[PDB]
Write a protein that binds this DNA or RNA. Structure first.
Length: 174
RNA sequence: GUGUGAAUGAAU
């Protein structure tokens, strides 16, 4: 070849004026690529304690040129970079189940299964209560749930992390 | 508010 790349992730958008909306971030992040989505992130009981956001692009290069310098949003200097929970993977394991992270109340069990069915076929989705940053899903094949883990997926515009589910009952069949 | 995503399940 003549170039290189690496696994993709969302850029954090630190330093927000705590008042800019979510779209206004995509309204400017389009200066680098096509911006698959954006998702402002903050607290869960105050709604006011992380003062940052997330943005995601169609390619990896578009996630390494933004972090090369700062940016001005709504008249406030901010920064973009790689968070402390990604760009640190290699491979998942075999299963018919998968796990989800960074989940939100904007989605639900059916909507997950309606989005996971594009990669093959879904058996079910599960989410315990009360609502938390995670979920689970089951697939119809032992290869779909082994080729979708760690892929930092997206649901209706909510980037969700994915990881290796672990059995609280029964066992694998490898 | 010093800017970081945090959160591994049933039905009996």
């Amino acid at each position: 070849g003549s170039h290189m790349a690496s696994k993709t992730s969302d850029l954090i958008v630190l330093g927000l004026p705590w008042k800019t909306t979510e779209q206004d971030l995509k309204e400017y992040f389009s200066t680098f690529g096509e911006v698959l989505m954006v998702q402002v992130k903050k607290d869960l009981k105050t709604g006011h304690s992380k003062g940052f956001g997330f943005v995601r692009f169609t390619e990896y290069e578009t996630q390494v040129k933004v972090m090369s310098q700062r940016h001005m949003i709504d008249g406030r200097w901010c920064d973009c970079k790689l968070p402390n929970s990604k760009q640190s993977q290699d491979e998942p394991l075999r299963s018919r189940k998968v796990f989800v992270g960074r989940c939100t109340e904007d989605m639900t069990e059916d909507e997950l299964r309606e989005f996971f069915s594009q990669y093959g076929d879904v058996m079910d989705v599960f989410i315990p209560k009360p609502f938390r940053a995670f979920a689970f899903v089951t697939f119809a094949d032992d290869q779909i749930a082994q080729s979708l883990c760690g892929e930092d997926l997206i649901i209706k515009g909510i980037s969700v992390h994915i990881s290796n589910a672990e059995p609280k009952h029964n066992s694998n069949r490898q």
